[PDB]
Structure formats: C-alpha cells, structure tokens
Design a protein around this motif. Structure first.
Motif, PDB file in Angstrom:
ATOM      1  N   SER A 644      -0.201  17.816 -66.784  1.00 42.22           N
ATOM      2  CA  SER A 644      -1.137  17.163 -68.731  1.00 42.22           C
ATOM      3  C   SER A 644      -0.685  17.790 -69.466  1.00 42.22           C
ATOM      4  N   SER A 645       0.496  19.281 -68.938  1.00 42.21           N
ATOM      5  CA  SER A 645       1.111  20.099 -70.178  1.00 42.21           C
ATOM      6  C   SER A 645       3.246  20.337 -69.539  1.00 42.21           C
ATOM      7  N   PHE A 646       3.453  20.681 -70.475  1.00 44.59           N
ATOM      8  CA  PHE A 646       4.685  21.078 -70.383  1.00 44.59           C
ATOM      9  C   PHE A 646       4.695  22.985 -71.478  1.00 44.59           C
ATOM     10  N   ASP A 647       5.949  22.891 -70.451  1.00 45.58           N
ATOM     11  CA  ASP A 647       6.073  24.458 -71.035  1.00 45.58           C
ATOM     12  C   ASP A 647       7.505  24.092 -71.811  1.00 45.58           C
ATOM     13  N   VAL A 648       7.792  24.527 -73.183  1.00 47.94           N
ATOM     14  CA  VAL A 648       8.829  24.700 -74.634  1.00 47.94           C
ATOM     15  C   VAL A 648       9.350  25.977 -74.843  1.00 47.94           C
ATOM     16  N   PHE A 649      10.649  26.196 -74.913  1.00 49.85           N
ATOM     17  CA  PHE A 649      10.611  27.172 -75.443  1.00 49.85           C
ATOM     18  C   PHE A 649      12.674  27.228 -76.926  1.00 49.85           C
ATOM     19  N   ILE A 650      11.959  27.868 -77.840  1.00 54.04           N
ATOM     20  CA  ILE A 650      12.812  27.574 -79.004  1.00 54.04           C
ATOM     21  C   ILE A 650      13.539  29.063 -79.440  1.00 54.04           C
ATOM     22  N   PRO A 651      14.619  29.007 -78.455  1.00 52.57           N
ATOM     23  CA  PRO A 651      15.510  29.902 -79.086  1.00 52.57           C
ATOM     24  C   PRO A 651      15.631  30.727 -80.372  1.00 52.57           C
ATOM     25  N   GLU A 652      15.746  29.562 -81.270  1.00 49.23           N
ATOM     26  CA  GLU A 652      15.972  30.014 -82.743  1.00 49.23           C
ATOM     27  C   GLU A 652      14.910  31.622 -82.452  1.00 49.23           C
ATOM     28  N   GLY A 654      12.895  32.356 -80.669  1.00 52.64           N
ATOM     29  CA  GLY A 654      12.586  33.269 -79.638  1.00 52.64           C
ATOM     30  C   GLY A 654      10.869  33.179 -79.626  1.00 52.64           C
ATOM     31  N   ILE A 655       9.989  32.191 -79.340  1.00 53.66           N
ATOM     32  CA  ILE A 655       8.825  31.600 -78.380  1.00 53.66           C
ATOM     33  C   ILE A 655       8.733  30.604 -77.664  1.00 53.66           C
ATOM     34  N   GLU A 656       7.855  30.622 -76.604  1.00 57.95           N
ATOM     35  CA  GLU A 656       7.682  29.947 -75.507  1.00 57.95           C
ATOM     36  C   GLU A 656       6.799  29.428 -75.783  1.00 57.95           C
ATOM     37  N   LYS A 657       6.179  28.337 -75.973  1.00 59.32           N
ATOM     38  CA  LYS A 657       4.963  27.609 -76.201  1.00 59.32           C
ATOM     39  C   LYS A 657       4.369  26.888 -74.891  1.00 59.32           C
ATOM     40  N   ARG A 658       2.994  25.868 -75.242  1.00 57.70           N
ATOM     41  CA  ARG A 658       2.983  24.855 -74.085  1.00 57.70           C
ATOM     42  C   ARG A 658       1.859  23.941 -75.058  1.00 57.70           C
ATOM     43  N   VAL A 659       2.306  22.475 -74.934  1.00 59.97           N
ATOM     44  CA  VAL A 659       2.315  21.027 -75.272  1.00 59.97           C
ATOM     45  C   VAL A 659       1.274  20.605 -74.414  1.00 59.97           C
ATOM     46  N   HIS A 660       0.489  20.920 -74.580  1.00 58.83           N
ATOM     47  CA  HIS A 660      -0.675  19.644 -73.967  1.00 58.83           C
ATOM     48  C   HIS A 660      -1.821  18.764 -74.039  1.00 58.83           C
ATOM     49  N   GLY A 661      -1.279  17.863 -73.369  1.00 60.77           N
ATOM     50  CA  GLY A 661      -1.602  16.717 -72.801  1.00 60.77           C
ATOM     51  C   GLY A 661      -2.754  16.190 -74.397  1.00 60.77           C
ATOM     52  N   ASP A 662      -4.042  16.669 -73.819  1.00 58.61           N
ATOM     53  CA  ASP A 662      -5.283  16.105 -74.666  1.00 58.61           C
ATOM     54  C   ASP A 662      -5.407  16.646 -75.909  1.00 58.61           C
ATOM     55  N   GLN A 663      -3.907  16.803 -76.963  1.00 55.67           N
ATOM     56  CA  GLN A 663      -3.564  17.431 -77.679  1.00 55.67           C
ATOM     57  C   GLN A 663      -2.640  16.026 -78.290  1.00 55.67           C
ATOM     58  N   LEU A 664      -2.471  15.699 -77.727  1.00 57.50           N
ATOM     59  CA  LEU A 664      -1.688  14.266 -78.446  1.00 57.50           C
ATOM     60  C   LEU A 664      -1.949  13.003 -78.428  1.00 57.50           C
ATOM     61  N   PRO A 665      -1.953  12.018 -78.924  1.00 51.53           N
ATOM     62  CA  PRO A 665      -2.159  10.566 -79.030  1.00 51.53           C
ATOM     63  C   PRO A 665      -1.699   9.838 -77.584  1.00 51.53           C
ATOM     64  N   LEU A 666      -2.582  10.418 -76.401  1.00 50.41           N
ATOM     65  CA  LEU A 666      -1.800   9.033 -75.159  1.00 50.41           C
ATOM     66  C   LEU A 666      -2.791   8.560 -74.955  1.00 50.41           C
ATOM     67  N   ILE A 667      -2.645   7.686 -74.033  1.00 51.62           N
ATOM     68  CA  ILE A 667      -3.204   6.413 -73.155  1.00 51.62           C
ATOM     69  C   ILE A 667      -3.889   7.077 -71.632  1.00 51.62           C
ATOM     70  N   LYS A 668      -2.689   7.630 -71.437  1.00 51.05           N
ATOM     71  CA  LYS A 668      -2.626   8.047 -70.159  1.00 51.05           C
ATOM     72  C   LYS A 668      -1.564   9.047 -69.788  1.00 51.05           C
ATOM     73  N   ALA A 669      -0.986   9.836 -68.883  1.00 48.12           N
ATOM     74  CA  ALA A 669       0.226  10.170 -68.187  1.00 48.12           C
ATOM     75  C   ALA A 669       0.413  10.876 -66.343  1.00 48.12           C
ATOM     76  N   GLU A 670       1.286  10.157 -65.878  1.00 49.55           N
ATOM     77  CA  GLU A 670       1.732  10.471 -64.183  1.00 49.55           C
ATOM     78  C   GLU A 670       3.259  11.023 -64.857  1.00 49.55           C
ATOM     79  N   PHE A 671       2.014  12.257 -62.830  1.00 50.49           N
ATOM     80  CA  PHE A 671       2.795  13.497 -63.200  1.00 50.49           C
ATOM     81  C   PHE A 671       3.532  13.481 -61.751  1.00 50.49           C
ATOM     82  N   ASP A 672       5.061  13.587 -61.779  1.00 49.51           N
ATOM     83  CA  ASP A 672       5.572  13.566 -60.204  1.00 49.51           C
ATOM     84  C   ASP A 672       5.857  14.724 -59.677  1.00 49.51           C
ATOM     85  N   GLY A 673       5.061  15.046 -58.598  1.00 48.59           N
ATOM     86  CA  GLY A 673       4.684  16.395 -58.264  1.00 48.59           C
ATOM     87  C   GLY A 673       6.711  16.687 -57.760  1.00 48.59           C
TER      88      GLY A 673
END
Length: 810
Positions: A644-652, A654-673
């Motif tokens: 329900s989230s994913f990490d992104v990094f921005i080399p320009e 020098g940070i790494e942060k996490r996008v959270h599904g529960d902070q996005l305007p979503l209907i659902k999410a599906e995960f393929d492990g």
C-alpha cells in the motif's frame, strides 16, 4: 511470560562470569524509530545476528546507545498498522490509523533517507545496563499537576517526566504559552516502579522556528555545548590563554626537513570554510622511482598531554560541520596558527611512499616526524578546476593517477577509475568538512585526496598495531548482518542484478559496474541501510580476525589524517610518536577503551548534527523553490514497492521518501508480491496536489498543525517549472539564492520530462490503463514517476512528504 512489569537489574558483579559461561550476551541497544515498542541489540561478533527485544518490559528501561546485557529467550515464547509490510495480485489498500500516520510523517520526513527495519533468529530481554555515556542531552518540547511532560525531538527517546518543580515558575498556569518553545532535558532516573523515565530541564533554547535556535537545538540534542573555551569574563570571546605550545630546537633539528623549495613542491590542501591540515608533494627521485609525500599537521606536538587544552579538546572530541555553521575541535587560536600556509614552517607527521615510476607500485614507505614549508595552497575546488581543465601530464595529473592506483588496489579492480564514487559509504566512516545540500555530491578532487588519505590511514594503522599491538587505537566497520545482506541481495536480484555479494570486494564492484546513474545510486542507498557506522576500538579488546573495515575493503584502519577536527587522531598521533621514538607507551587499556567509545559517541553525534542541519536547510530550499505553489513536481525513481506504499528517491536532492496509498485519492490498490508491482486505482479527475484525505481533517491529525497549508494545482506547478527550464531561470528566491551562494551551496536541480501542455509532459511518463471504470497506474521498481514534493512545516523539524501525481487528472 504473563504480566508487563519491569525486572530489577542483575548486580554488575555477576555479569562478567555469566557472559563467559554464555548465559548472557552483551551488545548495543538500538530502538526501531518506526516501531518504538521494539529494539535490537547488536553483538560485536558474539552471535550470528542481532537480538530482538520485544516491547517495553523486555527492554527494561534501557536507552538508545546503551551497552546492555541480554538473556536470550525461546523465539516462540516471545512471539499490523504498517502499509509497507510486503499471494498473487490482490486488493491491498491500507488506511493507517491517525497516530501511525502522524508518527510516520515525522519518522520518514525528518531524515534525508528512510531507515530500514525487518520471526527473528534470536530474541531476548535486557537484564542490566553495562555502560551509558553520561550527561546525554535531549532537545524537545514541554507540556502538561506534579509532572510536566518533555517530548524529545529524537523519537528513539521516550517521553520524559519532568517534576513541575523544575519547569518555569509560571508554566503550570500557562503551559500552552510554552508549546512553541524548545527546551533541553536530561534523564535522571528510571526505576522499575515507573513506566517512564524521570529527568531534569537543562535549558530553554527559544522559539522552535527561530533559525539560530534551530541550529543551537541540533547542536545541544547531539551533546555539543561548545563552551569548553569561552571566557567567564566575556562569553563572546575565547580565553586568550588557550594557545599552541611552540616547539623547542631539540625537536626541530631531529625532524625530516622538507622546507627546501628547490627539492620539494609541497601544496597544502584547504577545504572551504576550514583550515589546511594536509599537504602533499610528488617528486621524481631519478632512479625509476617516484615519491608521494603525505604530510599532516603535528597537532599534539603543540599540546601537553593532560593539559587543560587537551582535556577540553577531548571533551569536545569532534568538530561539527553544518551548511549553516561550523564548530571547531580546538580553540580558534590553534586553527589560525597551525593551519598550513605557503611560506610558513610547520611541524608535521609524514607518510612518504616510494613508487615504481612505471607501475606506481609502492616500493617502500617512510613514516616519521617532519617539517614542511608549503610552496602552494589549493582548495579542493581549485584542485577540481585544475584536474578537469588542465594539462593531462601536469603535476596534479600525476597525483590523480597515484590516487587512482591506490584506489584500484584497495577495491581490487586494476582498471578502476576514481569516478563514479560511493558518497554514502564514505559517510559511514567520516563526515564532510565542506558540506553540500546533497549528501550524494562528491567531486573528483575530494576523491583523489580522500583515496590518498585512506592509504595513509591504512599505513599508520598497520604501523601502530605492529609495534604497539593491543594498545593500538584502530577503526573498524562490520559487514552487514546476514539477514540484512540477504534482504539486500533479494532486492537487487528483483532488479535483475545477480552479482556476487559475499565479499565487499565483489559487492562494491557490482555496484560500480552499473551504468545507469539512478540505479547505481538507488542500489547504494539500499546497501547503505544495511550497515552501521564505523567504530573506533582498542585492538586488544577485539579479535584480530575482526579488525576489518568492510565499507573500505581494508583489513585494518584507523584515523590519522584529520587531527584538527577529530580527537581520536590525537591519540593515534601520540601512539605513532611512541612507535617512532621507540619510547614506552604505558596507557591503560581500559582508559583507552573509554576514550575510544566516547570518540564514537561524539563522532556519531557530529554526523547526526551535520545531516540534521542539511535536512533543515534543504526543507527551507524545497519550500522556497515552491513558494507560490506550496510544492514541487519532479521525476523520481521507484526504489521499493509495497502492498500500500512505495519508496522513491530523488538523486538531485539526495532524499528517499515513501508514497502512501492512504494519502492519495484512490478507490483501491492491488499488489502483486511475486512481480513486485503495485497497481493504483485512481479516482479520476482528483488532483493529488490538493487532495486532503478524509481522515486528516480530524483535529488529531498532524495536518491541523501544518503552518504551510496552501497547495496549488499540479498544472500550475508543471507550467512554472517547465517554463523556467527552457529559460534557465531560477525557481529559488533571490534572498535564499544569496544565502546559499554565501554558504557556497548549490540549488537543487529538478528532474523534468524531456519530451503538449506542461502537465501532460509529466503524465506521459506514467504507465496507465483504463479497464471499464478502473483507472489503473502501474508502479514498478526502478521506474520513473512524477512526484509532488513538499516540506510540512510545524514541528521542531520539518517533514518531507511525497505524493504521486494523479495521471487521471483533468
């Protein structure tokens, strides 16, 4: 195995024997910043892994950094709110509870990168505290009646109960008036009868968002009072009595002399905002050999061991370098008078390599006391200029090729080039002197001098261990624990890289082989998370099979090349002189152990201060760049995907942060492990830039305390950024641009799509599809994705937050 009550500690006397029998094991406690109810105890090669400490009871009132004695437990006897826990494709959107969301914004947002975490092999409980650095300080806020509650900004520190007799007099009545004030506190006691520690107030720092207070708070929270040299009569100045001791002619005559400017062209290296403590020469000896001389200021020849200056420098232990400010190790008078300068004769300690003039193999090494008189002084910036735009056979070009040959042998790759480099692995051993807004930045000039210094430090470590043996002050860095290496390997294998990770040798070579800059940086970030920083140690306290410095691929190491900013180097310098002069070295091993562990404490504090100050200024810069939009839009790379989230990094940045599904305007999410793919089902037409999750309108949400609440639409951000791109025009205000220029910092660059309205350019980078009423975006590891980037203002430290752009916006 029933209740939740703290057990009294075992008497100290029993532990030494109990450790020898294997009944107890010792280690350093580290609390999981994310899930503060748990903790790990790392063994110094006394077991195959770290020991899991479940809950508060088993931690038994131990604090972060404590050396603890732990008794192991059956993992079964010991044996939710996270949206990043990750049969086939399935519904996985997770709404974090308000408290968890609130904690995450701070833990994830208040550091540049993301801390790692992950039934264990071992589990135990704390039965005694063996050692704790005393007098630790904590910055934080105070609130409410016999107890006022101190909340440390360091989330690894529990709430501290302050008896209200210690808080300001008029605080009990108007506690809300102090809610925006920063205090410094200390922990005094924590008996088994209290669920929380008790402490005292040390200082009131001032307003939480005052720039000077922000820096003062970072310093105090990391135990730098910086008062060791101030004069009681006048606090603005330092006590003039603090001065370097001059050398007697007896010593000066005995030193190897490098002052003849006809024979040696020594150039001192200066670092922006700092002194010059290292100098070099290269000389053709004429017999098919070259000479590389490496010279370090002989600081301790100006300081009587045990004197007031020595003790006060030992207390400071490490200098601190922040973009906004620097704090010396030594009195200003030492910096000014001892800094290497052309025409100035200086006492030094030198390591001189004789090299084969064709292969550059080291034929011999000389180490001893010396005297230099530099002919030139170059900054690393000037060195860089000369190495790029200069003769390819010049004096400095030879220095680079020598550094490259040292480097190639160190990493066991004959064809190695000094770039690309591993900036994060360097920070496991040392801190930057000239600080950059981007922790990933390293220049060729720095790398050249750094690889020469790594060789010098290696040579000195070998020398002092050979002669002084068990009393040598060395520096090691442990390989990743098996479980974390196994996690790292799984990640890079999912990425498609199957290179060998069984040795630092092959692992580092695999990373350096990656042509894609973004992937190479991302994999380094993942590797960096598996390792603690290096540690000073006394050789006799550690098995000689475990002296290695993994990150540097070195069998033995120490710190010798920076005595003007590291106190450990003072000890090493005095040890080397004993070896040089073959005089008896009679320091107590236990005293040296206490010295090394204190150096570790203060050095890791200096590192934390440096990154905290970078993070602070970077958040201010991010918000100034989006002063009208309240946010930035940039391309980022996906590093890890979860349910329900994913990490992104921005080399320009020098940070790494996490996008959270529960902070996005979503209907659902599906995960393929299996395939590591997250499918976001977006609400069509809802802009992520302005979306307010329903659960964050609660007055209990962190959002209620956000001071910078305004967000423009995504389209407005895209337009302004792209219009400025073609124009080579700045997003940053002129006042801040002047500030960064004065600090010799560089404004971060956005990563824009190189492709139609501005927003469509960003949206065309996404992988989307429409299945009837499902508006699906695929999130893949190492894919590029447009990210909205903000620093939430409101807490003692700002919080970086990221959101995915809604590709189905109008």
């Amino acid at each position: 195995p029933d209740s939740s009550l703290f057990a009294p500690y075992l008497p100290q006397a029993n532990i030494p024997e109990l450790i020898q029998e294997g009944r107890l094991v010792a280690g350093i406690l580290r609390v999981n910043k994310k899930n503060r109810s748990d903790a790990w105890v790392s063994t110094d090669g006394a077991l195959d892994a770290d020991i899991y400490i479940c809950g508060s009871k088993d931690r038994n009132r131990a604090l972060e950094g404590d050396l603890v004695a732990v008794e192991l437990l059956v993992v079964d006897d010991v044996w939710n709110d996270s949206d990043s826990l990750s049969v086939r494709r399935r519904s996985s959107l997770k709404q974090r509870p308000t408290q968890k969301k609130n904690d995450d914004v701070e833990v994830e947002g208040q550091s540049l990168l993301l801390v790692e975490e992950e039934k264990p092999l071992y589990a135990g409980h704390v039965v005694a505290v063996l050692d704790r650095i005393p007098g630790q300080l904590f910055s934080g806020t105070l609130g409410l009646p016999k107890i006022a509650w101190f909340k440390p900004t360091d989330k690894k520190v529990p709430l501290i109960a302050i008896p209200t007799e210690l808080a300001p007099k008029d605080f009990v009545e108007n506690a809300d008036k102090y809610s925006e004030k920063l205090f410094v506190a200390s922990i005094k006691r924590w008996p088994i009868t209290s669920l929380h520690p008790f402490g005292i107030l040390v200082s009131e720092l001032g307003d939480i968002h005052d720039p000077d207070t922000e820096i003062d708070s970072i310093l105090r929270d990391n135990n730098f009072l910086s008062n060791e040299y101030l004069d009681q009569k006048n606090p603005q100045k330092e006590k003039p009595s603090f001065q370097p001791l001059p050398l007697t002619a007896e010593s000066l005559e005995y030193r190897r002399n490098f002052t003849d400017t006809n024979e040696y062209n020594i150039f001192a290296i200066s670092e922006l905002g700092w002194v010059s403590e290292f100098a070099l020469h290269v000389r053709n000896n004429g017999n098919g050999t070259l000479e590389l001389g490496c010279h370090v200021v002989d600081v301790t020849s100006h300081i009587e061991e045990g004197s007031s200056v020595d003790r006060r420098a030992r207390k400071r232990s490490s200098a601190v370098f922040m973009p906004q400010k620097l704090v010396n190790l030594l009195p200003q008078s030492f910096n000014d008078e001892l800094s290497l300068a052309p025409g100035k004769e200086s006492a030094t300690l030198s390591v001189v390599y004789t090299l084969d003039s064709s292969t550059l193999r080291i034929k011999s090494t000389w180490v001893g006391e010396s005297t230099i008189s530099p002919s030139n002084i170059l900054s690393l910036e000037q060195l860089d200029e000369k190495l790029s735009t200069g003769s390819p056979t010049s004096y400095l070009s030879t220095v680079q090729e020598i550094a490259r040959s040292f480097y190639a042998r160190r990493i066991n790759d004959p064809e190695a080039t000094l770039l690309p480099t591993l900036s994060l692995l360097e920070s496991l051993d040392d801190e930057k002197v000239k600080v950059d807004l981007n922790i990933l930045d390293r220049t060729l000039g720095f790398v050249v001098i750094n690889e020469i210094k790594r060789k010098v430090n290696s040579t000195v470590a070998e020398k002092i261990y050979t002669k002084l043996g068990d009393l040598a002050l060395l520096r090691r860095q442990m390989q990743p624990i098996a479980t974390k290496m196994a996690s790292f390997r799984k990640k890079i294998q999912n990425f498609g890289y199957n290179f060998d990770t069984n040795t630092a040798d092959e692992l580092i070579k695999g990373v350096l082989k990656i042509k894609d800059d973004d992937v190479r940086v991302g994999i380094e970030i993942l590797l960096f998370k598996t390792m603690p920083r290096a540690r000073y140690f006394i050789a006799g306290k550690v098995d000689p099979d475990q002296y290695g410095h993994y990150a540097l691929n070195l069998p033995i190491y120490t710190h010798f090349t920076a005595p003007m900013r590291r106190y450990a180097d003072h000890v090493v310098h005095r040890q080397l002189k004993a070896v040089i002069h073959d005089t008896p070295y009679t320091e107590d091993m236990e005293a040296l152990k206490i010295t090394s562990e204190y150096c570790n404490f203060k050095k890791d504090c200096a590192y934390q201060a440096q990154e905290q100050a970078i993070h602070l200024l970077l958040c201010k810069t991010i918000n100034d760049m989006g002063n009208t939009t309240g946010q930035l839009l940039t391309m980022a790379t996906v590093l890890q995907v979860y349910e329900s989230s994913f990490d992104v990094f921005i080399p320009e940045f020098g940070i790494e942060k996490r996008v959270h599904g529960d902070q996005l305007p979503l209907i659902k999410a599906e995960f393929d492990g299996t395939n590591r793919v997250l499918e976001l089902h977006w609400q069509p037409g809802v802009d992520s830039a302005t979306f307010i999750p329903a659960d964050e309108k609660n007055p209990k949400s962190y959002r209620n305390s956000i001071k910078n609440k305004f967000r423009s639409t995504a389209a407005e951000i895209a337009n302004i950024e792209l219009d400025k791109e073609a124009e080579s025009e700045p997003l940053i205000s002129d006042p801040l641009s002047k500030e960064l220029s004065d600090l010799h910092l560089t404004v971060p660059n956005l990563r824009l799509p190189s492709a139609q309205n501005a927003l469509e350019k960003f949206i065309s980078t996404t992988e989307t599809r429409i299945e009837n009423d499902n508006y699906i975006q695929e999130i893949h590891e190492l894919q590029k994705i447009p990210i909205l980037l903000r620093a939430e203002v409101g807490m003692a430290l700002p919080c970086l937050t990221v959101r995915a752009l809604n590709p189905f916006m109008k």
